[PDB]
């Protein structure tokens, strides 16, 4: 399978991480959502022409939440990851749509500023630590984002907080949130080399 | 079970309408999310106390998109709504993220700003655009929002692009997500009906101004 991406996308992290985690082997190749000669190619598939965008056995799919719930579904050999029980699934997507319309949004909405080299306002801060709020409560009730043990909102809400890396963020704060990131990262295979280059490639962004 | 909502959210209104289409019976109990008592109430079914939030038999249940795929799982005679071929609900999948991140998120973000009396800026309007570009080539290349017949995505979305209403938005520009409309609404159970009482509500409730 073909996944178009870039190691500094906080939504490109999910799949490659669960892939790992799966042992499932990706066809990597990075994407540059600012060429046009790539913008195109990648039209072609993804209309919305964003990263990361999944191609399995010529089937498209896009969105860091759509893929790694397909990945699971056709490639887990186990519902461990996506639970079929309603009342815990329910939970999971709770979680899912929590990260992409909540908690990485508000994240998201700094570090685009931040970049920009501009004061975000006193109060989106508010959205920010309250967002956080949520999460050190989600993981204070149980152990994992959504479950008793690690699920894919787990995956999806590590790229989201180890994000809050380009701003500086405090997490002494926020107890459960460390316990959480380092339970979760300490069950992601090859995850330190992860760490590294995403650690490093950031500050190389920053460079500029 | 029941269903802390309004009808004037446009997230509200999958819950309802799934409900209509699969007979489930929904225990409605309008909430006003601004009001501090209803407020705290809520907070201790959802800490994030937001609308819509389902509560089915002590399980609790928010984020309409949660609300949604959990009923049609737990009660849908037919997995038509919400197909389990992983080649037809990964489209499914990523038409609900991109109504809740992409389309119904420029929607509100504009909606907001009217509401405190300010101003989208250009590119606002213009990824505004490029949401309902995206939507209409997504009802062209089908019938349907995420496949060849009705989707849990067509009803998030038909709360989502209604919405517009609120901004006079001409969708004269759009003519496959007209047709769509009609399409999604004639498969809503007394849809009129539902509309009618939309009006009604959002009527009564600017009255509580
Ligand atoms: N909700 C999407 C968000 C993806 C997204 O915003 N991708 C950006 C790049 S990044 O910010 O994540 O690095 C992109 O493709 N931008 C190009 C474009 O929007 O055309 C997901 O989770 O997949
Ligand atoms: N993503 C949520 C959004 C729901 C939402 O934002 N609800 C608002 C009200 S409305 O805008 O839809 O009318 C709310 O309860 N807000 C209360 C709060 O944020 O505390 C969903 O789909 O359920």
Same mark, same amino acid.
């Given at each position: 399978?073909?996944?178009?991406?870039?190691?500094?996308?906080?939504?490109?992290?999910?799949?490659?991480?669960?892939?790992?985690?799966?042992?499932?082997?990706?066809?990597?190749?990075?994407?540059?959502?600012?060429?046009?000669?790539?913008?195109?190619?990648?039209?072609?598939?993804?209309?919305?022409?964003?990263?990361?965008?999944?191609?399995?056995?010529?089937?498209?799919?896009?969105?860091?939440?759509?893929?790694?719930?397909?990945?699971?579904?056709?490639?887990?050999?186990?519902?461990?990851?996506?639970?079929?029980?309603?009342?815990?699934?329910?939970?999971?997507?709770?979680?899912?749509?929590?990260?992409?319309?909540?908690?990485?949004?508000?994240?998201?909405?700094?570090?685009?500023?931040?970049?920009?080299?501009?004061?975000?306002?006193?109060?989106?801060?508010?959205?920010?630590?309250?967002?956080?709020?949520? $999460? =050190?409560?989600?993981?204070? #009730?149980?152990?994992?984002?959504?479950?008793?043990?690690?699920? !894919? +909102? /787990?995956?999806? @809400?590590?790229?989201?907080?180890?994000?809050?890396?380009?701003?500086?963020?405090?997490?002494?704060?926020?107890?459960?949130?460390?316990?959480? $990131? =380092?339970?979760?990262?300490? #069950?992601?295979?090859?995850?330190?080399?992860?760490?590294?280059? !995403? +650690? /490093?490639?950031? @500050?190389?962004?920053?460079?500029?």
């Amino acid at each position: 399978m073909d996944y178009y991406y870039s190691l500094i996308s906080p939504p490109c992290q999910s799949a490659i991480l669960l892939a790992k985690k799966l042992g499932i082997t990706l066809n990597l190749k990075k994407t540059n959502v600012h060429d046009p000669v790539e913008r195109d190619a990648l039209t072609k598939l993804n209309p919305q022409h964003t990263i990361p965008t999944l191609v399995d056995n010529g089937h498209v799919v896009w969105e860091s939440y759509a893929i790694v719930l397909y990945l699971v579904e056709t490639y887990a050999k186990d519902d461990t990851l996506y639970p079929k029980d309603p009342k815990v699934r329910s939970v999971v997507n709770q979680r899912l749509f929590f990260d992409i319309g909540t908690l990485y949004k508000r994240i998201i909405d700094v570090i685009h500023l931040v970049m920009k080299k501009e004061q975000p306002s006193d109060e989106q801060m508010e959205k920010l630590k309250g967002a956080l709020d949520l $999460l =050190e409560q989600f993981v204070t #009730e149980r152990a994992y984002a959504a479950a008793d043990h690690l699920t !894919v +909102a /787990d995956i999806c @809400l590590l790229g989201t907080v180890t994000a809050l890396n380009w701003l500086k963020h405090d997490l002494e704060p926020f107890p459960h949130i460390r316990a959480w $990131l =380092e339970r979760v990262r300490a #069950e992601m295979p090859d995850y330190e080399e992860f760490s590294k280059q !995403v +650690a /490093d490639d950031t @500050l190389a962004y920053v460079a500029s």
